[PDB]
Ligand binder design. Structure first.
Ligand SMILES: Cc1cc2nc3c(=O)[nH]c(=O)nc-3n(C[C@H](O)[C@H](O)[C@H](O)COP(=O)(O)OP(=O)(O)OC[C@H]3O[C@@H](n4cnc5c(N)ncnc54)[C@H](O)[C@@H]3O)c2cc1C
Length: 365
């Protein structure tokens, strides 16, 4: 009733936006997702995602995708290593924990979510450039593409979104660490020493404020990231400048790690950032709008916070808009944001404290 004959548009086909779309759509809501990626075959770069029982998994369950997530996700142990290649501890998964936090590939997750949507719910190759209100509908502008309208806009296009002003003036800011990530295909061939060191588990190592994280089996490829406190001699279009840089930082490290760096083809660098939720969001907005996911609360990832907060957002917001407990769309948005500010501020504070802890000089997992 609340959303009757209301055209809802979600900006961004990430995991949060798509989950939001499904939870709305299954309540008979007209929902469109606009995604800048040119087609659904676009590969998603990055490591795997793990859904927690009380948040991400609950969102999948309410969407009817929990068993699908289990069917595709993969339980994985963790090895803690030192710079000399020693395994300090192996934290393996007991049966009682095997489905607690199984890791799933980002493209796989996109696909199950896309498959849960009606055909053409998601419009590909639609990069939102500007969002402007009308007396009754939003006007959405796409780069070199026809414009669209909506009665309610949900910003879900990530932590670097540029279309937040009508909700908040808050700016993203850098937290002081930097990440270099890459994929190695056929790691059993290209980086065998380090591959066997992972030994089918995720691997983490810390030495001199330099942290390394790896997943040996991300749909047949090894994904890894190296992270450090920030402060440019490095061009990421020039793999040579990156290798020279990483090999200096990892001079103390075992050759198996040096092999990993030398064989990597393409490096991706990214400054860690946070969209701080300190100051409250705008009280009066021209038309119904809100934000979910990283657009709402981007935060450091080193403690495992991230997508699950965003899936919690989709769950509460979609509930509020469709559980009939609110007199207006605005009141339903108001309640969601109040809840999200509460448990989201907690997540951010945990993520900031962990970032300081892990890149401190004494850190030893
Ligand atoms: C190095 C690193 C490691 C991480 N590790 C983890 C981890 O282990 N676990 C975890 O839970 N989280 C992790 N995170 C965080 C996690 O990836 C995010 O919290 C999660 O992806 C949030 O999803 P989202 O849908 O809100 O945003 P995104 O995943 O960024 O999705 C945004 C979507 O919007 C699209 N988009 C962007 N601009 C536009 C536009 N103008 N118009 C239309 N569409 C647009 C994008 O193409 C994308 O499809 C990590 C992050 C980093 C940087």
């Amino acid at each position: 009733t609340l959303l009757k004959n209301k055209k809802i548009t979600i900006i961004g086909a990430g995991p949060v936006g798509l989950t939001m779309a499904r939870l709305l759509q299954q309540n008979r809501v007209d929902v469109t997702v606009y995604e800048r990626d040119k087609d659904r075959d676009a590969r998603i770069f990055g490591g795997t995602l793990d859904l927690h029982r009380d948040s991400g998994q609950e969102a999948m369950k309410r969407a009817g995708l929990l068993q699908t997530y289990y069917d595709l996700a993969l339980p994985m142990g963790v090895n803690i290593a030192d710079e000399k290649g020693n395994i300090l501890t192996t934290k393996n998964v007991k049966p009682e924990n095997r489905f607690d936090n199984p890791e799933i590939n980002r493209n796989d997750l996109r696909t199950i979510l896309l498959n849960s949507l009606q055909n053409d719910t998601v419009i590909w190759d639609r990069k939102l450039v500007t969002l402007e209100p009308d007396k009754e509908k939003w006007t959405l502008t796409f780069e070199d593409k026809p414009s669209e309208t909506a009665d309610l806009v949900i910003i879900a296009n990530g932590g670097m979104s540029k279309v937040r002003k009508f909700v908040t003036d808050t700016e993203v800011e850098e937290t002081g660490t930097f990440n270099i990530q890459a994929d190695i295909h056929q790691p059993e061939v290209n980086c065998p020493g380090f591959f066997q060191l992972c030994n089918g588990n995720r691997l983490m190592a810390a030495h001199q404020g330099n942290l390394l994280f790896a997943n040996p089996n991300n749909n047949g490829a090894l994904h890894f990231g190296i992270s450090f406190k920030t402060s440019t001699l490095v061009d990421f279009q020039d793999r040579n400048s990156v290798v020279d840089f990483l090999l200096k930082k990892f001079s103390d490290w075992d050759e198996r790690y040096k092999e990993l760096i030398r064989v990597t083809s393409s490096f991706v660098g990214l400054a860690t950032r946070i969209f701080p939720l300190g100051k409250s969001w705008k009280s009066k907005r021209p038309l119904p709008i809100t934000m979910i996911g990283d657009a709402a609360h981007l935060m450091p990832p080193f403690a495992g916070q991230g997508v699950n907060s965003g899936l919690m957002d989709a769950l509460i917001l979609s509930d509020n808009l469709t559980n009939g407990k609110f007199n207006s769309i605005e009141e339903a948005i108001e309640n969601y944001e109040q809840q999200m500010f509460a448990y989201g501020r907690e997540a951010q504070a945990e993520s900031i404290i962990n970032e300081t802890e892990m890149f401190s000089s004494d850190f030893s997992f």
